[PDB]
Symmetry: C3
Subunit: 231 residues, 3 copies
């Protein structure tokens, strides 16, 4: 395990996701409100899935070698397995907060699936120049998602409770900033142009992942917006 | 890319799915009705997914070699990845049109999953005679789906709005004819008996795919059946 | 096929799932009640999926070799493909019976996904001692599911119809006993410590699978709890 310099960040990531999972699990024990239960379920599952995939990367299972540029390049494929399930759960948290219509939710989840799926294909593609074609398609799917979060959701939040409108606005802003960093790190890291070494890349993704999951969850689950308006 | 004679049909397929995706995306921009949004979301996602998988076939990612009959046989596995997601979306379009009950929808999607999954296993099976066992099981799942579309849905459409009944009937008929061709092409093509060469097989699937997705979508999204009855 | 001593149990399993599938399919033909249709759909799909995966194991497709302990160890990976889809369907049968809230259903299905997914990783892991780390995480996800079935569902059933409360209690008890055997068989069988040989392991899983699917389904589909209260 320690044979890879990036192991320290995989281990820290595993620990922080594990701790985040346990914290949300305990916190949600005292919850009976049916609406709050939905948000706790979604939000606890996110770091639990990430915990398993960080562990698989730490132990070496979630790593494969991909030939491109005349080299055997270490590619952590387990990231995409994580993201396939956790990024639509994160979007679902946002969509339920603002009572999004079903068509909009399906558009978001579908675009998200395309985003992660094409990122996976790009990560595993052996023809170097083609990796960036997949990156571009994935990034276009991301831009669609960000567009919807701003010009379909923000003006939906404003007709809702003030506490859900303010909580949505904060989580929207956190999401757009954090999620936009992922394609940049991929592009300059070992999957793309290879300018930033894998150990630093792994650190960067770990900070983004913990912030986008445990950070996000801490903000959401401390808000009164997750509860039905009750006396 | 041009090293494979079937590349021209993969390229045309990619282009037509891409163009179809953009057309539906633009067309649905001016839509606020919650019901119509569902149909636009579902129907736009279908060629978008197909676009990505056609591209993966064009670039060579979605192709593998399978030993059977003492030969290395080129198998485009990306078709099944496409179909796994797009065929239940197509069925969902039909089921929502007639306000199908939840049990019926689950039966359809489940049978569809079995249909595509067993087709994939058959496509990748190395014992030649066993490929046709999987083809038979998949075809039985197809026949179940077609049965339900006729003797569970058609008489559901007739108690609904005339515009939804007439639109459903047309899309049902398009679906049954087009979908029934797929097992025949598989059986006589490079996956099955090998009587029709891969380049012609690829052409045939491209015509079926564009018709079943973009053709289907053009009929559906031009109907007033996708809108709630409103003043 | 007969080259593997466990083939007889794979063949019997295939037959019993096939027969169970046909029986439930015929039985549900005379059903119009929308609630009952849901239970028939879910419950018929379960042995149908299991039939396909038992067949893939019989024909040899669903088997791979995994190096650990200095040996090539036969691992039937198709079990996890089965279980990935059938165990959440089984939980859905239980959850719908007691009209579980959406948050609880998502927690169950999510924990179940983690349970099966980590079992799959453990089954395919090449470092022997690490296989048991994945077994432990999977078992913890199982224990969560069993906890919810007892201390979240049982007291939900009691405020419902007596026929649904009594049917739920029986199916809950069947589920907890049968499902708890699976991690034990894995641990002592060819995936784990290797004390029980593969042919006996295969027998054990076949008895558990038929009981947990066809047995379970026979109890559920003969109950009046699956019908809406109607005059
Ligand atoms: C009911 O609605 C609220 C339940 O949501 C909360 C439900 C949770 C989503 C349940 C899912 C967590 C499972 C219990 C997962 C089990 C293994 C976990 C990964 C635990 C890992 C952390 C520990 C090992 C440090
Ligand atoms: C509604 C939304 C969910 C829409 C989803 C959007 C989605 C369509 C976007 C594209 C997804 C698609 C790229 C998934 C591809 C998975 C694939 C990378 C798995 C690895 O297999 C690739 C090659 C080795 O590189 O296998 C070597 C050759 C092997 C023989 C491969 C044969 C097995 C195939 C992988 C079977 C395909 C199954 C499905 C792709 C399962 C989807 C997995 C998940 C990653 C989407
Ligand atoms: C809101 O409900 C309506 C939105 O549906 C319409 C929503 C669409 C389903 C959004 C999904 C499309 C994504 C934007 C996919 C991005 C890449 C596409 C494959 C674009 C490819 C076509 C172009 C490259 C020729
Ligand atoms: C409700 C509905 C959805 C019901 C669904 C119906 C469904 C049950 C029908 C059968 C689906 C099942 C056949 C999927 C099999 C996928 C498999 C072909 C992927 C390729 O792996 C096959 C061999 C190489 O040929 O791998 C070589 C050996 C490797 C070590 C394989 C180990 C990895 C396994 C593939 C893990 C299994 C994961 C699940 C099958 C994911 C499902 C993928 C999708 C195609 C259904
Ligand atoms: C409508 O709601 C009730 C339908 O549920 C019942 C619907 C069923 C879930 C339909 C799914 C079964 C498909 C017809 C599967 C076809 C192949 C089967 C595996 C048949 C195998 C058994 C036989 C070959 C012995
Ligand atoms: C809401 C709930 C559903 C939550 C779900 C919980 C879930 C997160 C729990 C963990 C699931 C995760 C372990 C699935 C891993 C599948 C993996 C074993 C498939 C086989 O690939 C493993 C190695 C060979 O051993 O591939 C060799 C290297 C290859 C290059 C691998 C590259 C292809 C990757 C497999 C692509 C990943 C796609 C997704 C994992 C699809 C999920 C399949 C299913 C088994 C969950
Ligand atoms: C918890 C993990 C999260 C929130 C991950 C988010 C990841 C993305 C938004 C990834 C986006 C990518 C692209 C837009 C193109 C390049 C490849 C990706 C997959 C890194
Ligand atoms: C957009 C793509 C569509 C509508 C594809 C439909 C495909 C089928 C109905 C495929 C059916 C098959 C069988 C019935 C058995 C042989 C294998 C298949 C998968 C080709
Ligand atoms: C129809 C099949 C059923 C009901 C299978 C149930 C399987 C399980 C509950 C498996 C549990 C496992 C663990 C808890 C850890 C070890 C690995 C598994 C996957 C066997
Ligand atoms: C969105 C953030 C992307 C920028 C990442 C900056 C990383 C700077 C680290 C120094 C680069 C290491 C190069 C020498 C090894
Ligand atoms: C459902 C349509 C299946 C029939 C396809 C007919 C294809 C005819 C093309 C000629 C066959 C090529 C054989 C000589 C290369
Ligand atoms: C939950 C049941 C697990 C116990 C399984 C008992 C199997 C006993 C069979 C005898 C073991 C075979 C060892 C000699 C080959
Ligand atoms: C490819 C995996 C996509 C599914 C991820 C799980 C999250 C799905 C959330 C469903 C949202 C509800 C839509 C109506
Ligand atoms: C194996 C992939 C199956 C899922 C495909 C996505 C479409 C699912 C549509 C869900 C229909 C709603 C059922 C209640
Ligand atoms: C990884 C596969 C998980 C999906 C299995 C299919 C069963 C899903 C049942 C959905 C229950 C409804 C939740 C709201
Ligand atoms: C186009 C929608 C406006 C809100 C999205 C902001 C786009 C940020 C760009 C992210 C950088 C990705 C490379
Ligand atoms: C049995 C249901 C009647 C409607 C379905 C028509 C079946 C068409 C056969 C398709 C050919 C597949 C090989
Ligand atoms: C902790 C919840 C109480 C009900 C679950 C009973 C646990 C049975 C243990 C199963 C054995 C697995 C190794
Ligand atoms: C070796 C790099 C070749 C450049 C490929 C860039 C493709 C980016 C596509 C953006 C439309
Ligand atoms: C080499 C071909 C052997 C014939 C197999 C046909 C099987 C079809 C099954 C239909 C019930
Ligand atoms: C070779 C076996 C080494 C023992 C591993 C047991 C790990 C079990 C983890 C339970 C917390
Ligand atoms: C990680 C295993 C958890 C089993 C005990 C249940 C914890 C309490 C959860 C309350 C919903
Ligand atoms: C509760 C702490 C969980 C941390 C387990 C994984 C950390 C890796 C240590 C090497
Ligand atoms: C908008 C046109 C999209 C076409 C891109 C793929 C066509 C392949 C050209 C070689
Ligand atoms: C209807 C009987 C189904 C049995 C088919 C599979 C049994 C395997 C026989 C070798
Ligand atoms: C993006 C950083 C999130 C910070 C989380 C802090 C949570 C405290 C309530
Ligand atoms: C099956 C062929 C479909 C033809 C689509 C034409 C759409 C015009 C409205
Ligand atoms: C766990 C054993 C189940 C027994 C099923 C018998 C069904 C008869 C109604
Ligand atoms: C990591 C366990 C958290 C302890 C409880 C925190 C207050 C709910
Ligand atoms: C008003 C919300 C500001 C949140 C910005 C957080 C940036 C990481
Ligand atoms: C809305 C601001 C987006 C900031 C992008 C930051 C990418 C590192
Ligand atoms: C391909 C872009 C379509 C242009 C608009 C067509 C009329 C909505
Ligand atoms: C009355 C509907 C006829 C549609 C037939 C289309 C055949 C491709
Ligand atoms: C309902 C008519 C079906 C026609 C099947 C055509 C197969 C090529
Ligand atoms: C296996 C076929 C079952 C025959 C009908 C049983 C009574 C519904
Ligand atoms: C009162 C229900 C008892 C069911 C026990 C079944 C054990 C297999
Ligand atoms: C509730 C009793 C569980 C029995 C476990 C049996 C495991 C073989």
């Amino acid at each position: 395990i320690t044979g890879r310099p990036e192991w320290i960040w995989l281990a820290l990531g595993t620990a922080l996701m594990g701790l985040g999972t346990l914290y949300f699990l305990v916190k949600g024990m005292g919850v009976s409100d049916p609406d709050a239960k939905k948000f706790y379920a979604i939000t606890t599952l996110v770091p639990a899935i990430a915990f398993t995939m960080y562990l698989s990367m730490l132990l070496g299972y979630g790593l494969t070698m991909v030939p491109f540029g005349g080299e055997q390049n270490p590619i952590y494929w387990a990231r995409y397995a994580d993201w396939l399930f956790t990024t639509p759960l994160l979007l679902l948290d946002l969509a339920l907060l603002v009572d999004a219509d079903q068509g909009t939710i399906l558009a978001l989840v579908g675009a998200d699936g395309i985003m992660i799926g094409t990122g996976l294909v790009g990560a595993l593609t052996k023809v170097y120049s083609y990796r960036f074609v997949w990156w571009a398609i994935s990034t276009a799917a991301m831009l669609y998602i960000l567009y919807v979060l701003f010009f379909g959701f923000t003006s939906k939040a404003e007709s809702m409770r003030p506490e859900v409108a303010s909580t949505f606005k904060v989580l929207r802003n956190v999401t757009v900033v954090l999620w936009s960093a992922y394609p940049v790190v991929w592009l300059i890291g070992s999957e793309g142009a290879g300018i930033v070494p894998l150990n630093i890349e792994t650190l960067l993704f770990m900070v983004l992942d913990v912030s986008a999951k445990v950070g996000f969850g801490l903000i959401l689950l401390r808000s009164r917006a997750i509860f039905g308006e009750a006396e």
